[PDB]
UniProtKB/Swiss-Prot annotation, chain A:
One of its GO terms (biological process) is DNA repair. GO terms for cellular component: chromatin; Ino80 complex; NuA4 histone acetyltransferase complex; nucleus; R2TP complex; Swr1 complex; TTT Hsp90 cochaperone complex. Changing residue 66 to A: Defect in snoRNA accumulation. Growth defect at 37 degrees Celsius. The gene is RVB2. ATP binds at residues 60-67. Present with 3030 molecules/cell in log phase SD medium. It is found in: Nucleus, Nucleoplasm. The keyword Metal-binding does not apply. Belongs to the RuvB family. InterPro entries: AAA+_ATPase, P-loop_NTPase, RuvB-like, RuvB-like_C, RuvBL1/2_DNA/RNA_bd_dom, TIP49_P-loop. This is RuvB-like protein 2. DNA helicase which participates in several chromatin remodeling complexes, including the SWR1 and the INO80 complexes. The SWR1 complex mediates the ATP-dependent exchange of histone H2A for the H2A variant HZT1 leading to transcriptional regulation of selected genes by chromatin remodeling. The INO80 complex remodels chromatin by shifting nucleosomes. Its ability to induce transcription of some phosphate-responsive genes is modulated by inositol polyphosphates. The INO80 complex is involved in DNA repair by associating to 'Ser-129' phosphorylated H2A histones as a response to DNA damage. Its main location: nucleus.
From Swiss-Prot, chain B:
One of its GO terms (biological process) is chromatin remodeling. One of its GO terms (molecular function) is zinc ion binding. The gene is VPS71. Zn(2+) 1 binds at residues 34, 37, 54, 58. Belongs to the SWR1 complex at least composed of ACT1, ARP4, RVB1, RVB2, ARP6, YAF9, VPS71, VPS72, SWC3, SWC4, SWC5, SWR1 and HTZ1. Its main location: nucleus. Zn(2+) 2 binds at residues 46, 49, 62, 67. A zinc finger (HIT-type) spans 34-67. Participates in the catalytic exchange of histone H2A for the H2A variant HZT1, an euchromatin-specific factor, leading to chromatin remodeling and changes in transcription of targeted genes. Indirectly involved in vacuolar protein sorting. The chain holds residues 211 to 280 of 280 of the full protein. This is Vacuolar protein sorting-associated protein 71. The keyword Metal-binding applies.
Length: 426, 70
């Protein structure tokens, strides 16, 4: 998975010990002790899997670590467990109702593991002999590290091998039941033992994936095209009852996951009303909601609310609150960011960055590191010194300074009333 | 006694040939098993003589002691 550097690449975990007590700086996370402790409690609840339909609200001031906390929870939760992260603005679609979009998001975060035991023969082919009707007579020889035997083919196997046009001397894989043939290069690699092996393959799917697969004749393309449409509720009921029966039979297990809505303050009252009931039912994942606004008017309503959310939903949620950082934590977060971005800052440069971040914003100081690095490279210098950061500060403006400039020159910008003085004279 | 001329042709026919099956030769399915251990899960024919084996251990056993044509 090759990709560039993001703003959350350094957070490789939640940084807890055995007793769920977070360390001062571990797994890329700094500070936020109580928030990380509560996030570890949530993570343990997710791993247990015995608790369903819990909503946790991650509230606090901006640039405090809500998305960082969610990313740490996701990484510590690891793979092999669903984690759906959708912004609140992704629900509003022209093809799916908001309730249907929320339902699909809810189903995406509940995983189902199905084990399929397949009999497949793997080895290095040697000879193939196919003859005309005397329907068809055929013999193939497969060599491995310790066996070399011939196989008497039948009609359909001969047809399949002719369709694949398998050559000789190339590693081949044939499935006894399905009949699929997977080609491989000449034996770096080599056959490793018995001709016919018994290895199980596990398929990880979500409830939404099963719903879409059964939705149409070839619905599994919609998982990529996105033209699923509002699935009939009877189909979902069928999926649910069959998943219950499979779990009872023991031929499939359920892996509950986490659904993360980053900007819940954009969902309307209908979405919250739907969420209230969707949480109650079984197969409901754990919903993490991140909000920042203190008291705002819920979208679709004309009244204020304690977080931009209706009181019914807040009654159903437990709130994890994040607190603003101080100078030392800003310093160590910037050091981690600089190490991630492969930038060697000096001590005085780091101190200047820390004071700038405390005065203005942590994100502003975080973004200045790469610009400072590029400025230094223009001077053919390796380490970023104070003057490079000062030039970066002079060239690029923050929110407060930009606001001050706009306020002091309000005539030359377009205002809310649509007035501007383009003419430099008069 | 069998070679004795006192046993007539039709008597010999009824005593030995007639009692055997003559019409139904195989009504049950044909089951092929490993020549070494009788297994059936996996079957393959040895390259040398065309007899059936099932596993690497049976392969070595057949090659070392059972293979006739080599
Ligand atoms: N506790 C933390 N440990 C490490 N980095 C953090 C922490 N909190 C915030 N950050 C960094 O600050 C940046 C912005 O944080 P963000 O996730 O946007 O918070 P919010 O969503 O509340 O604004 C991220 O790139 C992240 O790397
Ligand atoms: Mg955020
Ligand atoms: Zn055998
Ligand atoms: Zn043989």
């Amino acid at each position: 998975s090759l990709s560039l550097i993001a703003a959350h690449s350094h957070i490789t975990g939640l940084g807890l010990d055995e007793n769920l007590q977070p360390r001062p700086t571990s797994e890329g996370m700094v500070g936020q002790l109580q928030a990380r402790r509560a996030a570890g409690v949530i993570l343990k609840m997710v791993q247990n899997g015995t608790i369903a339909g819990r909503a946790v609200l991650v509230a606090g001031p901006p640039s405090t670590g809500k998305t960082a906390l969610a990313m740490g929870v996701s990484q510590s939760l690891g793979k092999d467990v669903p984690f759906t992260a959708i912004a609140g603005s992704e629900i509003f679609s022209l093809e799916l109702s908001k309730t249907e979009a929320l339902t699909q998001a809810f189903r995406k975060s509940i995983g189902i593991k199905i084990k399929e035991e397949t009999e497949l023969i793997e080895g290095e082919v040697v000879e193939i002999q196919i003859d005309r009707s005397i329907h068809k007579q055929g013999k193939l020889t497969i060599k491995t590290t310790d066996m070399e035997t011939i196989y008497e083919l039948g009609n359909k196997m001969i047809d399949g091998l002719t369709k694949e046009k398998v050559l000789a001397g190339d590693v081949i894989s044939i499935d006894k039941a399905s009949g699929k043939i997977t080609k491989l290069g000449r034996s770096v690699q080599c056959p490793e033992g018995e001709l016919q092996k018994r290895k199980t393959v596990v398929h990880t799917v979500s409830l939404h994936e099963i719903d879409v697969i059964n939705s149409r004749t070839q619905g599994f393309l919609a998982l990529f095209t996105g033209d699923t449409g509002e699935i009939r509720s009877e189909v979902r009921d069928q999926i649910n009852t069959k998943v219950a029966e499979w779990k009872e039979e023991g031929k499939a297990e359920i892996v509950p996951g986490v659904l993360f809505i980053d900007e819940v303050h954009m969902l309307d009252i209908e979405c919250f009303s739907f969420i209230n009931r969707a949480l109650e039912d079984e197969f409901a994942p754990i919903v993490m909601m991140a909000t920042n606004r203190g008291v705002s008017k819920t979208r679709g309503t004309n009244y204020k609310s304690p977080h931009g959310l209706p009181l019914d939903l807040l009654d159903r949620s437990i709130i994890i609150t994040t607190k603003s950082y101080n100078e030392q934590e800003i310093k160590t977060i910037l050091s981690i960011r600089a190490q991630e971005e492969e930038v060697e800052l000096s001590s005085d440069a780091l101190d200047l960055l820390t004071k700038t971040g405390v005065e203005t914003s942590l994100r502003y100081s975080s973004n200045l590191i790469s610009v400072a690095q590029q400025i230094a490279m223009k001077r053919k210098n390796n380490t970023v010194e104070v003057e490079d950061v000062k030039r970066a500060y002079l060239l690029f403006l923050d929110s407060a300074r930009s606001v001050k400039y706009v306020q002091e020159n309000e005539s030359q910008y377009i205002d809310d009333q649509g007035n501007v003085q383009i003419s430099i004279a008069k | 006694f069998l070679d004795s001329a006192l046993l007539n042709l039709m008597d010999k026919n009824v005593i030995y040939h007639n009692v055997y099956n003559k019409r139904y030769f195989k009504v049950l399915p044909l089951i092929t098993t490993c020549s070494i251990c009788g297994g059936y899960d996996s079957i393959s024919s040895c390259v040398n003589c065309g007899n059936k084996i099932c596993s690497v251990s049976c392969f070595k056993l057949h090659n070392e002691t059972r293979c006739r044509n080599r």
